[PDB]
Amino acid sequence: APLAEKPFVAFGSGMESLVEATVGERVRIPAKYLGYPPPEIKWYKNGIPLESNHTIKAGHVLTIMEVSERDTGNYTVILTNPISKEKQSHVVSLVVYVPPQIGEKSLISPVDSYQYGTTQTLTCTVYAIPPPHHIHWYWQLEEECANENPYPCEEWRSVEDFQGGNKIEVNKNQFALIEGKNKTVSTLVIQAANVSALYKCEAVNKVGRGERVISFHVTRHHH
Amino acid sequence: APLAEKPFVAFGSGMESLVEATVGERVRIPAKYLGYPPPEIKWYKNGIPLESNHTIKAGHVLTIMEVSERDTGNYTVILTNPISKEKQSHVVSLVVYVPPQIGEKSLISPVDSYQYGTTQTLTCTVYAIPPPHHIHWYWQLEEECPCEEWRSVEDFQGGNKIEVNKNQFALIEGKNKTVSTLVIQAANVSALYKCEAVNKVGRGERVISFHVTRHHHH
Amino acid sequence: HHGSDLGKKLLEAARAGQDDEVRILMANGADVNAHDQNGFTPLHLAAWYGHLEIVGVLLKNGADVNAFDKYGFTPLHLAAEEGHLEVVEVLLKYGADVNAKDEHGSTPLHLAADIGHLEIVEVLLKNGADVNAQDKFGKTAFDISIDNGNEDLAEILQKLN
Amino acid sequence: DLGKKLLEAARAGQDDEVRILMANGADVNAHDQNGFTPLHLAAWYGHLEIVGVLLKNGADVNAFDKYGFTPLHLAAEEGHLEVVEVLLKYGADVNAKDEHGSTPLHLAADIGHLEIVEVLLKNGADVNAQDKFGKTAFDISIDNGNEDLAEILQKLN
Numbered sequence A: 001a002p003l004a005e006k007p008f009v010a011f012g013s014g015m016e017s018l019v020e021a022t023v024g025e026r027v028r029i030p031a032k033y034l035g036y037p038p039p040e041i042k043w044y045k046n047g048i049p050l051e052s053n054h055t056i057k058a059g060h061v062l063t064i065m066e067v068s069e070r071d072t073g074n075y076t077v078i079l080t081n082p083i084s085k086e087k088q089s090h091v092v093s094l095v096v097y098v099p100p101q102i103g104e105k106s107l108i109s110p111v112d113s114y115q116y117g118t119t120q121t122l123t124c125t126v127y128a129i130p131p132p133h134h135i136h137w138y139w140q141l142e143e144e145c146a147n148e149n150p151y152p153c154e155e156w157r158s159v160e161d162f163q164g165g166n167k168i169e170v171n172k173n174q175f176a177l178i179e180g181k182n183k184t185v186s187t188l189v190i191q192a193a194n195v196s197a198l199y200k201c202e203a204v205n206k207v208g209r210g211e212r213v214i215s216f217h218v219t220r221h222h223h
Numbered sequence B: 001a002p003l004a005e006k007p008f009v010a011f012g013s014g015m016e017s018l019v020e021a022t023v024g025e026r027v028r029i030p031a032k033y034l035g036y037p038p039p040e041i042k043w044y045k046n047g048i049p050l051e052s053n054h055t056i057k058a059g060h061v062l063t064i065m066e067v068s069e070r071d072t073g074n075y076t077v078i079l080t081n082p083i084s085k086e087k088q089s090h091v092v093s094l095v096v097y098v099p100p101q102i103g104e105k106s107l108i109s110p111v112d113s114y115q116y117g118t119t120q121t122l123t124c125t126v127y128a129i130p131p132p133h134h135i136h137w138y139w140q141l142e143e144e145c146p147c148e149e150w151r152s153v154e155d156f157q158g159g160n161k162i163e164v165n166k167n168q169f170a171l172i173e174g175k176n177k178t179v180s181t182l183v184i185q186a187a188n189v190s191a192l193y194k195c196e197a198v199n200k201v202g203r204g205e206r207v208i209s210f211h212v213t214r215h216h217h218h
Numbered sequence C: 001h002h003g004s005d006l007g008k009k010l011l012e013a014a015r016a017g018q019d020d021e022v023r024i025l026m027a028n029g030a031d032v033n034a035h036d037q038n039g040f041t042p043l044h045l046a047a048w049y050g051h052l053e054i055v056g057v058l059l060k061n062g063a064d065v066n067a068f069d070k071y072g073f074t075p076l077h078l079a080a081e082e083g084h085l086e087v088v089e090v091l092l093k094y095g096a097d098v099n100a101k102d103e104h105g106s107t108p109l110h111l112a113a114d115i116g117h118l119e120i121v122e123v124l125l126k127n128g129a130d131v132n133a134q135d136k137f138g139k140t141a142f143d144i145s146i147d148n149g150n151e152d153l154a155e156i157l158q159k160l161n
Numbered sequence D: 001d002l003g004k005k006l007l008e009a010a011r012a013g014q015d016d017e018v019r020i021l022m023a024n025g026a027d028v029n030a031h032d033q034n035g036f037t038p039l040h041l042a043a044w045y046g047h048l049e050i051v052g053v054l055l056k057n058g059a060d061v062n063a064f065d066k067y068g069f070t071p072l073h074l075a076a077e078e079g080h081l082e083v084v085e086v087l088l089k090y091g092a093d094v095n096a097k098d099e100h101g102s103t104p105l106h107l108a109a110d111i112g113h114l115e116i117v118e119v120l121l122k123n124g125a126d127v128n129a130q131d132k133f134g135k136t137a138f139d140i141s142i143d144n145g146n147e148d149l150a151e152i153l154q155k156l157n
């Protein structure tokens, strides 16, 4: 304690200044204090004072029960000594990561059938924070999978390993501003549908992966 | 008005300690303070108190309207609490950068033309803060044009064979100058040469005329 | 008819707080909206040095209260930064823009918060200062006050809405 | 007239041809009865090269046509992103107002060019500017039922 021993307030030495979390988890940011009597605490997000409700508790530990992407921001905590009114403050940057989200539904419950010979484009609209560091396409012959997420295929083939499937090309990524966010639009072109298959796009980023399975069943309607 | 608390004086945590500027810019060095009542501020350079005039104002923010190289140095600001008379001091280092200047001396010669076929040197003496990180040479014929197109001296086709010596450093005006020398191997073609010097804060250049002549008393 | 030199004299008379000299220069037709190579007008200098009476005289004779110099500073910027409270109030009374931005995006509220002038901050706030305004580094006045460890100021820097 | 030829060459994207007219003394700021200059026409049709050539040869980046449209207005309305960036680089007034009070941000919002809206905003577009019907870009996004546009603008609102 300080040589002059009088009521005081200070932060504990271990205070973080960056905190990382993933969408959905509980976040805890402790305001560690030294001094006497126990200080009064107040939290601010980007300068706006926080009040406690069922979503967030702003006490000695700032607790966000289920962090969301909109919770990213700079949190300032101000400690006040209740006797002397001396104050200390500390800023914590909270960054909320998002594992890759694919907009198109992965639902094979009705199976998509295509006429023999047609050209079709499969698409994956991918959002992740940080952005995905790769987006890969995979495929499999329909016979080696189930139809009935039933993890339909036990093995997947890279679209580089295209022998025996449909003629396919992966287009360059495009980008779209959706819900205010830069989303990556990944497209696979099936040139002439002659082989029944399942296709999968997979996105990976720092905190997770996401995938979408697409059924590509081929039939020849006649007359 | 703010509630009056016990008297105190301190610098704000964001008080600067290094300031960078370029010759000619306005410089602002604020004395950020905490305390009550608001402190008296006084600025010092070389131990002498600064007074305000139309070139410089020494108030809560030290403002230099057009900084010069000679303004470089350590400035001390002292906060004085008007009730308690307590004092705090803080030193700011001011660094002033100078875009390159090419010495007019050692560039101007007593020679109108140089004899055909001889070796000759053009020299470019540069003063800059920080020292120039590159010095480049260019050339052009007068006939092919203060010109819109310049060629790098690596290209010898219509010009002279040339080599650039590595930068050397010399104290000439009481100041450390960088010296770039262009070596014309055999003066065979009249031309214009340009040395251009670049540093962190700007560029400077000088164009040199290089007249070649076959008149001689041989 | 006109004395071009008179504007240059009026700038320095206003800077040096030479009340009687300002009065003589204006009576001889000096241009209250003269500017120098910094972009300073007489109102800039009088306000910057807190020469309250001269500030009133220039405002009363048509000085542009919202003029901005070569770096985007208005007389309100200069007066706020220097802690000249009474000058700040008369500028605001004559229609100064409390949320004028300089070339780095700073408002008078940013400038006063960074120096630490609590009463100036209070006056700016009660006259419509935008607490949410960000400079070009993305800093609000609140952010700036916290960077300085000035928690008393941070508690002041809260919207009156 | 050379100016008439230059207008049509810029409109028709004749990249190599405008250069021939340029060497022959054609007026880069020639205008027609619409008030269109060659720069208006090159930017409106997204001819990035020609826009560059004209700008380097003194084309007036802020010329108003008869209805108040500036080249940046036209490039924004038609979705020519790279052209919009080059106009802004050469000093286009991001908040130029046409006869209706519309800024480039208004025109891009009404059509629905989200990326153009984003570029205008980060180059100083005034999100609060009202046209002569009192409409802001946000108002336009509500009127058009454009939720993706609203979400870009809402943050800065």
Ligand SMILES: *[C@@H]1O[C@H](CO)[C@@H](O[C@@H]2O[C@H](CO)[C@@H](O)[C@H](O)[C@H]2NC(C)=O)[C@H](O)[C@H]1NC(C)=O
Pocket: A045, A048, A049, A050, A051, A052, A053, A054, A055, A056
């Ligand atoms: C519980 O409290 C939090 C924070 O105190 C609220 O978060 C606000 O969310 C809205 C959403 O648009 C933001 O505009 C506000 O800025 C947030 N508040 C702060 C202080 O930043 C949350 O809405 C509250 N939830 C309930 C159900 O009351």
Ligand SMILES: *[C@@H]1O[C@H](CO)[C@@H](O[C@@H]2O[C@H](CO)[C@@H](O)[C@H](O)[C@H]2NC(C)=O)[C@H](O)[C@H]1NC(C)=O
Pocket: A162, A163, A164, A165, A166, A167, A168, A194, A195
């Ligand atoms: C479906 O079409 C593809 C594409 O034409 C066929 O794959 C080709 O197969 C031949 C011989 O089998 C090869 O020489 C080609 O190089 C293949 N092309 C590609 C792009 O790989 C495939 O055989 C067809 N399958 C069926 C059942 O008809």
Ligand SMILES: *[C@@H]1O[C@H](CO)[C@@H](O[C@@H]2O[C@H](CO)[C@@H](O)[C@H](O)[C@H]2NC(C)=O)[C@H](O)[C@H]1NC(C)=O
Pocket: A175, A177, A182, A183, D115, D118
């Ligand atoms: C969305 O993200 C992509 C990927 O980062 C952006 O594209 C990059 O833009 C930078 C800077 O303009 C370029 O240097 C890169 O070459 C681009 N990369 C690719 C793969 O194109 C894109 O600009 C972003 N779009 C929006 C609207 O934010």
Ligand SMILES: *[C@@H]1O[C@H](CO)[C@@H](O[C@@H]2O[C@H](CO)[C@@H](O)[C@H](O)[C@H]2NC(C)=O)[C@H](O)[C@H]1NC(C)=O
Pocket: B045, B048, B050, B051, B052, B053, B054, B055, B056
């Ligand atoms: C403005 O004030 C500064 C000092 O506050 C003056 O600078 C001095 O210039 C002389 C040269 O004549 C130097 O010898 C001094 O050392 C300088 N003072 C310093 C560096 O503190 C400047 O001359 C003044 N200008 C005026 C009064 O017009």
Ligand SMILES: *[C@@H]1O[C@H](CO)[C@@H](O[C@@H]2O[C@H](CO)[C@@H](O)[C@H](O)[C@H]2NC(C)=O)[C@H](O)[C@H]1NC(C)=O
Pocket: B072, B073, B074, B091, B093
């Ligand atoms: C300004 O003051 C600083 C000290 O605050 C001087 O820098 C010191 O220089 C000596 C010798 O070169 C070193 O031993 C110290 O470590 C330096 N101090 C540091 C790095 O904090 C500086 O030379 C002074 N400059 C002027 C112009 O007065």
Ligand SMILES: *[C@@H]1O[C@H](CO)[C@@H](O[C@@H]2O[C@H](CO)[C@@H](O)[C@H](O)[C@H]2NC(C)=O)[C@H](O)[C@H]1NC(C)=O
Pocket: B131, B169, B170, B171, B176, B177
């Ligand atoms: C003038 O120029 C440079 C300063 O940038 C000095 O060059 C340095 O010299 C020392 C020893 O002489 C070397 O260890 C460094 O590596 C040199 N720096 C570079 C970038 O080459 C030079 O000594 C200075 N001389 C004077 C008298 O000021």
Ligand SMILES: *[C@@H]1O[C@H](CO)[C@@H](O[C@@H]2O[C@H](CO)[C@@H](O)[C@H](O)[C@H]2NC(C)=O)[C@H](O)[C@H]1NC(C)=O
Pocket: A046, A073, A074, A093, C137, C138
């Ligand atoms: C939270 O604080 C950080 C650090 O001050 C802010 O990040 C800076 O943002 C500015 C512009 O907004 C950038 O120029 C800097 O490069 C950023 N620095 C770092 C270290 O990231 C961040 O913007 C703040 N958050 C909010 C919501 O304002």
Ligand SMILES: OC[C@H]1O[C@H](O[C@H]2O[C@H](CO)[C@@H](O)[C@H](O)[C@H]2O)[C@H](O)[C@@H](O)[C@@H]1O
Pocket: A025, A026, A027, A028, A029
């Ligand atoms: O790192 C020391 C702390 O570990 C835990 O906190 C982390 O894990 C929590 C539960 O997943 C998160 O809510 C929190 O944000 C993480 O930092 C522990 O809960 C703390 O008491 C420890 O000090």
Ligand SMILES: OC[C@H]1O[C@H](O[C@H]2O[C@H](CO)[C@@H](O)[C@H](O)[C@H]2O)[C@H](O)[C@@H](O)[C@@H]1O
Pocket: B157, B158, B159
């Ligand atoms: O005369 C046509 C040629 O001109 C250039 O080459 C030379 O031109 C100069 C004329 O004396 C020479 O001094 C100079 O050194 C040469 O570059 C052109 O590059 C050639 O390709 C032409 O045929």
Ligand SMILES: OC[C@H]1O[C@H](O[C@H]2O[C@H](CO)[C@@H](O)[C@H](O)[C@H]2O)[C@H](O)[C@@H](O)[C@@H]1O
Pocket: D045, D046, D047, D048, D079, D080, D081, D082
């Ligand atoms: O001029 C009509 C065409 O407009 C677009 O193409 C123009 O704009 C592109 C950039 O936005 C340029 O790359 C291209 O040179 C322009 O012609 C549009 O993409 C075309 O479909 C239209 O026909």
Ligand SMILES: C[As](C)(=O)[O-]
Pocket: A141, A142, A143, A194, A195, A196, A197
């Ligand atoms: C070609 As099949 C092999 O999926 O009927």
Ligand SMILES: [Ca+2]
Pocket: A085, A086, A087, B005, C152
């Ligand atoms: Ca206090």
Ligand SMILES: [Ca+2]
Pocket: C016, C017, C018, C019, C051
């Ligand atoms: Ca006086």
Ligand SMILES: [Ca+2]
Pocket: C092, C093, C094, C095, C096
């Ligand atoms: Ca007022």
Ligand SMILES: [Ca+2]
Pocket: A087, A088, A089, C149, C150
């Ligand atoms: Ca503190």
Ligand code: NA
Pocket: C134, C137, C138, C139, C140
């Ligand atoms: Na910010």
